Amino acid sequence: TPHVAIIPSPGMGHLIPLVEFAKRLVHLHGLTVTFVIAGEGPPSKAQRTVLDSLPSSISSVFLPPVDLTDLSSSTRIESRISLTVTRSNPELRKVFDSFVEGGRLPTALVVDLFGTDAFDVAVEFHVPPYIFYPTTANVLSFFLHLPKLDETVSCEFRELTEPLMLPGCVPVAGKDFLDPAQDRKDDAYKWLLHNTKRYKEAEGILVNTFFELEPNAIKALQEPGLDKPPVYPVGPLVNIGKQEASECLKWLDNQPLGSVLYVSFGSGGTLTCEQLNELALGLADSEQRFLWVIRSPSGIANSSYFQTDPLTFLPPGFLERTKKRGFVIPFWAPQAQVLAHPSTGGFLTHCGWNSTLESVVSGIPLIAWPLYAEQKMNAVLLSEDIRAALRPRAGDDGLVRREEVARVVKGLMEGEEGKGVRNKMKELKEAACRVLKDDGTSTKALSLVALKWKAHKKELEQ
Ligand SMILES: O=c1ccn([C@@H]2O[C@H](COP(=O)(O)OP(=O)(O)O[C@H]3O[C@H](CO)[C@@H](O)[C@H](O)[C@H]3F)[C@@H](O)[C@H]2O)c(=O)[nH]1
Numbered sequence: 001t002p003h004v005a006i007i008p009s010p011g012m013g014h015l016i017p018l019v020e021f022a023k024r025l026v027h028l029h030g031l032t033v034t035f036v037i038a039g040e041g042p043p044s045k046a047q048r049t050v051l052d053s054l055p056s057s058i059s060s061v062f063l064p065p066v067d068l069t070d071l072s073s074s075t076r077i078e079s080r081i082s083l084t085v086t087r088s089n090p091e092l093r094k095v096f097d098s099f100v101e102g103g104r105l106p107t108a109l110v111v112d113l114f115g116t117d118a119f120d121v122a123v124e125f126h127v128p129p130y131i132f133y134p135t136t137a138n139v140l141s142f143f144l145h146l147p148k149l150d151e152t153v154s155c156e157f158r159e160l161t162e163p164l165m166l167p168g169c170v171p172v173a174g175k176d177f178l179d180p181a182q183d184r185k186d187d188a189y190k191w192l193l194h195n196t197k198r199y200k201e202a203e204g205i206l207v208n209t210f211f212e213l214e215p216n217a218i219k220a221l222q223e224p225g226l227d228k229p230p231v232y233p234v235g236p237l238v239n240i241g242k243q244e245a246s247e248c249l250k251w252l253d254n255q256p257l258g259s260v261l262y263v264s265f266g267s268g269g270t271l272t273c274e275q276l277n278e279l280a281l282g283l284a285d286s287e288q289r290f291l292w293v294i295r296s297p298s299g300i301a302n303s304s305y306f307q308t309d310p311l312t313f314l315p316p317g318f319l320e321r322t323k324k325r326g327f328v329i330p331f332w333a334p335q336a337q338v339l340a341h342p343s344t345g346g347f348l349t350h351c352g353w354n355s356t357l358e359s360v361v362s363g364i365p366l367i368a369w370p371l372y373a374e375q376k377m378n379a380v381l382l383s384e385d386i387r388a389a390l391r392p393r394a395g396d397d398g399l400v401r402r403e404e405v406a407r408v409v410k411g412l413m414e415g416e417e418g419k420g421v422r423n424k425m426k427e428l429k430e431a432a433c434r435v436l437k438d439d440g441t442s443t444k445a446l447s448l449v450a451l452k453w454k455a456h457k458k459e460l461e462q
């Protein structure tokens with residue numbers, strides 16, 4: 001049976017959808033999978049747990065940590081994570097040597113959006129390289145266009161006076177392009193660009209999205225183009241929130257249907273002091289029920305990407321006033337279970353794509369609060385094109401004040417404003433079901449890929 005090797009780049013937002021993708025490969029298609037895990041230090045924590053309790057058809061190899069101690073502590077995350085894959089190639093080659101010895105040379109090597117240098121090892125071993133793309137078809141289009149964009153545009157992107165509007169894509173202002181594009185002199189941009197120039201080497205790109213969610217972008221991506229690999233929407237691949245977990249879910253059990261606003265800023269997002277304070281005050285002001293996963297504030301929006309009690313940062317009396325109607329949990333919540341809970345009615349999110357898909361699958365309307373990476377691009381998509389998210393208004397200084405927090409929260413949870421998005425998410429919840437049926441468009445696309453892999457293995461062994 002084909003053996004697929006999956007090489008994620010660091011980040012829970014990459015490992016989680018890759019684990020869901022692997023489970024579908026083994027359960028639906030009878031393949032075997034090995035995760036090969038690169039890291040700049042020892043594996044977490046959450047990494048070992050997400051890779052725990054998987055069918056025996058899925059194994060994990062943790063590589064020796066690579067040495068990135070030569071890098072500035074101010075190095076951007078995208079540099080760190082791309083380099084982690086790049087510098088792990090020697091160790092990845094040893095793993096592929098063991099696969100050859102075990103009669104299990106992979107049929108494909110699947111990297112994610114920042115791990116294309118692993119293609120060097122795939123090519124050396126005559127293994128087809130593929131990318132699993134954990135974010136939108138809109139942002140995939142941007143990555144595919146980036147080599148041309150880079151060539152044709154010579155200013156920093158924030159200086160563009162017209163928005164970029166790729167075929168089938170929501171327009172995005174240069175100042176809203178994903179964070180690592182925002183400083184072309186930084187190695188974050190060089191690693192972004194380098195990765196995108198390698199996309200044409202992929203035999204196919206599987207994207208965690210679905211037709212009804214991004215119909216125009218998907219149609220455009222699937223049109224033949226110069227050096228453009230085939231693109232397969234295979235989503236939404238999410239944890240549907242049916243696994244066994246506690247205190248926050250007990251609290252949730254005691255709230256009315258559709259009444260709770262879940263608030264979470266991903267696996268690594270934080271707010272500034274000033275913004276954390278205004279958000280807290282606005283949540284309390286709103287008088288809505290809320291479940292907030294809280295991290296300590298920082299001037300760096302992705303500072304917990306990979307300490308202090310976050311509750312010590314909350315304003316005077318905040319925990320007292322909200323003691324019944326609000327549940328504040330430090331660091332991490334069982335998000336899949338929360339979004340699937342009947343008492344959840346809304347989601348204030350950083351627009352991480354896994355959180356977005358989870359919310360879609362459960363029909364939970366959003367407040368779009370982007371922080372870093374490509375989240376702003378996602379927010380513009382979700383609010384202006386898909387129309388399943390409301391956006392808060394930020395002042396000219398970039399702060400979303402308590403009045404606006406309370407306005408948008410009430411608007412989502414009870415207002416006319418929130419009716420449009422709530423209806424839209426209902427339609428998307430239904431379409432998310434449709435596409436993953438035996439003959440749904442996402443299942444068909446994944447099936448075609450798995451069929452290609454089976455045929456490749458067949459021709460090789462015979
Ligand atoms: O308290 C918590 C918090 C999160 N989780 C789970 O962690 C995953 C969060 O992934 P998500 O894509 O929303 O955010 P993040 O990891 O910041 O995204 C990066 O990777 C994403 C994929 O490329 C990208 O769109 C984004 O911009 C990047 F920043 C998602 O499956 C949540 O259910 C949880 O269980 N409990």
Ligand SMILES: Oc1cc(Cl)c(Cl)cc1Cl
Binds near residue numbers: 011134135139180
């Ligand atoms: O998962 C990611 C996806 C994207 Cl598009 C960026 Cl820019 C950064 C991270 Cl960490």
